[PDB]
Design a protein around this ligand. Structure first.
Ligand SMILES: *C1=CC(=O)c2c(O)ccc(O)c2C1=O
Lengths: 302, 298
């Protein structure tokens, strides 16, 4: 029993973290096969970040201008190319610890594990969700460039995030492993602000489904709803519910017997009046239905 | 910068997880050097077992140890308290620098939940004052270990054993000594638990370092506060506690300087601190320094 924010084992990702240094800038890189991936602003300085011409700044760099270190051993850069906001450095040696991997772009509401690193060395690992405003509520200090977010299913690591910058409000922004930013953000020093954030309904519902499997049932009512009316009643800044969403909540709905619209109506009423569910006073929205099924893996009666 | 419940990198521990099978019982084991550590309940099947007789009536080939496909030949077996030690033919080449440490109530560690010798996830948790853990364990997670990483040395401090009726979990250190008055026998109940004040204070320091300061005031002392703390079930604060909070006080406000702010936060909470409305008590002072200074292991 028990329910905790569970991150994936980070060992497979640890074997790929390297240190990338260009000029006076040093950040983390992802060593997969014979290519090292790192944010492209490593070739920048503080003065260039006010209006950087990345293509022009990269032409003025050569292969040995990039120092890639895996522990103490140095990796010779034999090629460099740029893909969106990510810099790709081809090296002479293929990483022997390279796992089976994928580059995947995730959707708002999905969760993943972040391995915070500094100087190519792991500092910690934690779970977080891609917020609807395309930001992540993580924990990052200066030098966390190149720290990656990922999911591990079977023995294949699905890389889905590379950290880049901190927004004024304290949240973090980044790209996928193809260099494309999540949201309307850019890797340049300009006035940028995260848009208004919303609560992930499907994660709150899955988390409520968790609580039921898990002892807490005080919040259930004998009320149902439809799709539109509940999505309209969101005034409380809750993400609208979709048909694919109720199809993902299907397995949890069957295991418990409560339907999605039955819990949608129950969720309404924790909103109208809002003591602790699963030990927390706030409604948690960073637990996907898959996370609940993974930890609350019980039989479904049919 | 942000503050999250941060677990240690589990790579060094993943390389030590193995599967131990005895008869029909299967759990997880810790492969360090040429010894595999696992709960002695693998040798069962029993509600009140005499482990000493059950182990003498067992031989080396009665234990099936698997790392991946690879079978580890058991060339010796011994028992220390509630932990079983299995000598194997091959020393683990992935053995990291390690230490066996018994932690104290209130200290935190990372749990690598495993099933059938394969690591499933990692999460942080604290040793509650009642010597229990509020973790997440399913059937087959027996033998999963808790640990701390300092420099390149892994400090193993917990081995999961059982789930108590209230849903909370109990286990031993790596020497087989249970945490609390629990035994690997069928009935035991966790005693009354309290909140770890020194962790609540350190967590308040973390909020301060991160921008959240709405709760700070300009003034109380030890006696007064633990008078206010005993009723909210906050574990009493000691002088060693404020000396550990010293480094955080210098980096930033003193302990009692913040103690009054906590008194007021207990007395009456209208917002969330660090994004949570509840007072978090699973962050030790070292945990805050680790997350705000960006300490890297290895
Ligand atoms: C799994 C592991 C274990 O160690 C244990 C134990 O020590 C006593 C009773 C039970 O049921 C278990 C168990 O299921």
């Amino acid at each position: 029993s028990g329910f905790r924010k569970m991150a994936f084992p980070s060992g497979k990702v640890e074997g790929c973290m390297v240190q990338v240094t260009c000029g006076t800038t040093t950040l983390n890189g992802l060593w997969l096969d014979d290519v090292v991936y790192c944010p492209r602003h490593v070739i920048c300085t503080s003065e260039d970040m006010l209006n950087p011409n990345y293509e022009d700044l990269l032409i003025r760099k050569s292969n040995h201008n990039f120092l890639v270190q895996a522990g103490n051993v140095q990796l010779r850069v034999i090629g460099h190319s740029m893909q969106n906001c990510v810099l790709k450095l081809k090296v002479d040696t293929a990483n022997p610890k390279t796992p089976k991997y994928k580059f995947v772009r995730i959707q708002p509401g999905q969760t993943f594990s972040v391995l915070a690193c500094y100087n190519g060395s792991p500092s910690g690992v934690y779970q977080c969700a891609m917020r609807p405003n395309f930001t992540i509520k993580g924990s990052f200090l200066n030098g966390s460039c190149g720290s990656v977010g990922f999911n591990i299913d079977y023995d294949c690591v699905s890389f889905c995030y590379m950290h880049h910058m901190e927004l004024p409000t304290g949240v973090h922004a980044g790209t996928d492993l193809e260099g494309n930013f999540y949201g309307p953000f850019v890797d340049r020093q300009t006035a940028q602000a995260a848009g208004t954030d919303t609560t992930i309904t499907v994660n709150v519902l899955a988390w409520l489904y968790a609580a039921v499997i898990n002892g807490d049932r005080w919040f259930l009512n004998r009320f149902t709803t439809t799709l539109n009316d509940f999505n309209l009643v969101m005034k409380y800044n809750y993400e609208p519910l979709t048909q694919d969403h109720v199809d993902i909540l299907g397995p949890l709905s069957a295991q418990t017997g409560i339907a999605v619209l039955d819990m949608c109506a129950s969720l309404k009423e924790l909103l109208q009046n809002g003591r602790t569910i699963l030990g927390s006073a706030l409604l948690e929205d960073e637990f996907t239905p898959f996370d609940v099924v993974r930890q609350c893996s019980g039989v479904t009666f049919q």
